[PDB]
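Let's practice the habit of predicting before peeking. Look at the sequence and jot down your guess about where helices and strands might fall. Then scroll down.
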Amino acid sequence: PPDVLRWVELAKLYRSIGEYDVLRGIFTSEIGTKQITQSALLAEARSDYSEAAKQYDEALNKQDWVDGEPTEAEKDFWELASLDCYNHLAEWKSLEYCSTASIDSENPPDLNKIWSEPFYQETYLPYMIRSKLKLLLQGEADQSLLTFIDKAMHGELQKAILELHYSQELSLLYLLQDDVDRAKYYIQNGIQSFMQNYSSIDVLLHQSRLTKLQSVQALTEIQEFISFISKQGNLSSQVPLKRLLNTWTNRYPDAKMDPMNIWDDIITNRCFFLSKIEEKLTDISSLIRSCKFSMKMKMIDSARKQNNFSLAMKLLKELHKESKTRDDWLVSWVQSYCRLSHCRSRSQGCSEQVLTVLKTVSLLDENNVSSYLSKNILAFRDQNILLGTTYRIIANALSSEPACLAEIEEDKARRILELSEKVIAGLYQRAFQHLSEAVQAAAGVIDAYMTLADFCDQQLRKEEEQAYPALVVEKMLKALKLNSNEARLKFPRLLQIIERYPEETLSLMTKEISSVPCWQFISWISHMVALLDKDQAVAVQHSVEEITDNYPQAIVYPFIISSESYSFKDTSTGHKNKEFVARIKSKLDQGGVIQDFINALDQLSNPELLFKDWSNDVRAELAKTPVNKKNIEKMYERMYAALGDPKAPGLGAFRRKFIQTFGKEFDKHFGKGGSKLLRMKLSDFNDITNMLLLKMNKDSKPPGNLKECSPWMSDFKVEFLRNELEIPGQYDGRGKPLPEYHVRIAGFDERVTVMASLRRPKRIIIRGHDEREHPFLVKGGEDLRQDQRVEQLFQVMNGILAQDSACSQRALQLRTYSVVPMTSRLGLIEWLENTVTLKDLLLNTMSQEEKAAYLSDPRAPPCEYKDWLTKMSGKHDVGAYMLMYKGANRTETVTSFRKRESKVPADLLKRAFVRMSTSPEAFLALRSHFASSHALICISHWILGIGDRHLNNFMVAMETGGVIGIDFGHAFGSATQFLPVPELMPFRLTRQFINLMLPMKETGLMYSIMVHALRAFRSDPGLLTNTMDVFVKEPSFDWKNFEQKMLKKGGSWIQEINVAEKNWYPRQKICYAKRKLAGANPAVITCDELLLGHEKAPAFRDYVAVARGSKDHNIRAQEPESGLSEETQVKCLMDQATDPNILGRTWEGWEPWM
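Done guessing? Here is the structure:
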C-alpha cells in the first residue's frame, strides 16, 4: 500500500532519536487491527518487559486468526518488538536464536546471507553481533564469531560497515584474542567515531545527545584498561591494583537517570576487565571478589528503583550462590529481596498481595539468627523495620477487603492466621513490637523514627472512628531535631494532635520543642503566628521568641495580618497572651520602616475600585437586618483613613498624585458622606452611590504615569544600618539561612506599568543590592494567602515528581511563580520575562480578515452560541440554561457543535508554531515541549480538583514553549458545586490541542505523559494527603472569605444558596480527593459533587445524565465505579474532556470551541 510503509519509515526515524512514546503512538492506530498489539503495549508502556514478549512468542506461532489477516506490515514488527523487549532485559541467550533463525534453520551458515537484501542488513545484524558478544563475555569458548569476522574482513563492501560502525565490540574481541595493538587502533577509531558522530547532531535535539553521551564512560574504561595493562610500572606490587580498584568502585553511573542497558554495559565490562587483570599478573582475589559482589549488589539496588522488576528478579536468583561465606552478604541479600517484594507488591491485586509477601517469610527464620543480629544492632534495626512493614502490609491487605481473602489456599490461611478480627489486632501488635524495638535500638536511625511516625499516624486516622499520642510526638520531634525533608512537612500533624488531645501529653511537646533548631519552622510560621489568638498558644512561645530574636526579619509580614484580628481570653491565662503579643509587637517593628513600606505601597493602587469594594461590602453587610452593633462605625474608619481629607494622606501616609485629584475634588460630595454616611443605619438606597460611582469613572485619570504617585519609594537613599528592609519572599525552608546575603532593596525605577485585567494591577521595576533589576507585580485589594498555600502545594508536588525514575528521565517539572501577601489586600507576585497569555497567542496568530469575521460577525461562534441558546430555550440570558438542559436532546447539540466550530480556522496552533521557528530541526523540539508541559499541568490540575481553566489562565514562554498555570480561585472540588451553571470537564483539551499533533493520534504523547504522571503520584506515603488535609483544616475562608473573593471577580455569581453554604464541610473535600487519588471512576466523582451542591435543582437528572455517559459512544459509562487502573482513569478523562454532549452546553466565556 502507498500509505502504510510511510508509517513504517516514520517509525524507523523516530526509533533513533529516543522518543519512545510517539513511536508507540502509531503502533496502536496504523499498524493495528488486532488485540495482542494493545494487550502487549499496555505491558510495554509500563516498564514490564516480560509479559510484553511472553505474549509475542505466544503470538508468533498463531494458526487460525479468522477475522481477516495480519498484513505483512506487522508480522515483521512482532518479531522486531520481540527482539527489542528481549534486549531491554537480560535475555541474550533467547535473543540469538530468535534473531538469526528467520532466514533458514538447521543452525544456518550466517556468513554472507546477512550481507544480502538490505532489509537483512540493518535489522537482524546489530542484535546478532550484540547478543553473541554479550554471551561470549560471560566466559566460555563457543567459537562462532571470529570466523564470521575474518570472512567479513575481506573486501571493501563487507568491511566499510563492520569497521565503520561497531569497533567497540571488535576492540573487545581482539582484546579477547590478545592482539592489543590492533585493539588499540580499534578503540582509538572508536573514540574518533564518537567525536565525528556527536559533531553532526543538531544542538537543540536533546536526549539524542544524551543517548550518544552516555557511552563515553565505557569507552574510557576500555581506554584505561589498555593504558593500564601495557605499563610495566604496575607488575611489581599490589598498590596500583588497590588504587585502581578503589577508584573504580568509587565511580558509578547514577540510579534513577540511566536506562538499564548502560548499567549492563559498564558492569559486565568491569567484571571481565577485573578478571583479566587478576588472570595475567598473579589475600588479593578474595578482596577482588568482594568488590565484585558489592558492585553487583549496587546494580541490583539501582535496578529495583525503576520498576525494571524481572531483570531484578533474575539478578537476585543469579546472586544467591556467592552469598554464603560472609554473613552481611546474606543479610543484605534478604533485606534486598524483602524490599524488592515490597516495591513489587505496591501494584498487585489484593488477592495476590498477601501471597507475594507471605512467600517471603521462610528465609527470615533462616540463618543470620546465628549471632549476627547481635553483632550489629543496626542490622537488627533494619530487620525489625522490614518485618514490621511486612506485617503492616499483610494486615492492611485484608482489612481493606472485608474477609473474603481467606477463601482460597487454606494452608496459607492457616499460615497467616497461625501468626474473624482477632488476628488483625494480633498482627498489628506483632508489627508494633518490632517497630518499638527500633526507636530504642550516618542517619541510620531516622528511618527507625519515621516508620513509627507514619505507622502511628495511620493508626490514629484509623481511630477517627491506647497511648499512641504519647508516643508519636517525641519520636517525631527527636528526628525533626535532625535534618529531614520528610519531617519538615509533617509538623501540623503534631499541631493538630495536641489541639485535639490537650490532656494527652501537652508537656511532652513543650519539653521537646525547648531544644530544637529554631530555623526549621520558617516555612510553617503562618501556622504558628495565626495561633496566637486562640488557646494552646502556650506550648509554643519560646520558639516564636527565638525567631523574633535571631531572625527578626522573617516573621514580620505574617505577624501583621494575624494581628489584624485577635480577641483574647478574659481569664488571666489570656492576660499573659495579650502580654505576649504586646512584647513581640514592641520588640518587632522597632525600625518603623516596614509600616511606611506597606503604606506607600498601599498608596500605589487604584482606590477608585476600592470604593466599589467598599460599596459592595456595605450593601452586603447591612442589607439583612439592622441589628448589627457598631460594625458600620468600626469599618467606616478604614475608609476614612485612606480616603476623605487631603491631610490624612499627610498624617498616615504620603501625598498621593491620585489623592490630589480625588480627595480635593471630593468635598462637595463627601460633606454628604460626613452627614449621612457616618450615621446611616438604613441600607435601602445605594442608587445615589451608583450614580456618583458612574460619574467618577468618566473623568478620572488612571494614568499615574510615574513613580511619583508613591513618593516614599522614589527617593529611597539608604544611609547606614537602620536595620535594612531585606526584600520580601525569601526564607523558604531549606537549611540554615544566611541572613546577610539576600538582596537588600535599594532603589525603585521611575517606570510603572499597569496591567489590563479586571482589577488592573501594577508592575514595578525594583532594583538590587546585587545590581540586578527584579521586577514585581503589586496586587492591591485581594487576599493572597491561598496562592501562597498552593505554591507550597506545587512545591511538594514536584518534589514528589523527581524521585521516581520514569519522570526524572523525561524531566517533568511544574513552574512555580512566587507570591507573597505583605498585608491583607496587598500582595507582591513575581513577574515572568517575555511571556504571552494563551488567548493572545491564538488571537494574534490569525490574519486580519479571519480575526475580523471571528470577532465581529452575527453567526460568529460566540454570537451564534447565544443565538442558539435563545432559539433553543426561549429566553435570552442566564436563566435559559435550566430550560436548555432538560429541553434538548443529544443529536441536535452534537451536530450544532460541529456546525459552529467549523467556521473558525483550523491550523491555528500549527501556524503559531511555524510563524517563528525558521528551522524544521527546531519545530520538533519546540512542539514536543509544549505538548509535554501541557499534558503534565492538565493532569496536575485535577488531583486537587481545579476548574475554570479558560483562555487567560495558561501562559506560554516563547523561548522554549512551556505553559504555566496561574490564578487559582476554585481550589479544591468547588468549580461545579457553587457555580450556578456547572463545569464537568476535568481539564481543557479542546480542538486546537488536537489539531496540533495531527497526523499523530491523541494517544502518543499526551497519553503517556498523563499515565506516567498519575502513576508517579499515587504511590506516595500520603504527603499530598496530609498537606491537602492541613490546607483546608486551617480556617481562614470559612465560606466568608470564600464568598468575598467570589464576589470580587465580576462574573455571574451572587450567593443566595442557604443549603450549600451549610454544606461547606471540609471532611468531604478530603474524602473526594482521597477517592480520586486512591482510584475511582471520574464520572462517579463529578456526579457526586454535583449532587452535594445542586440538590433539588430542576434539571438535576439531566446533569447526572450528561455526566453519566451513553454506553454506546462514550467509554466513560461502560466502565465500573471503583478499583480501576491508571490507563482506564485517563481514558475516561480524555473521553470526558472531548465529548460534544458536554462541550456543547458549557459557559460561553469559557470558550469551548477555539
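How did you do? The longest helix spans residues 377-400.
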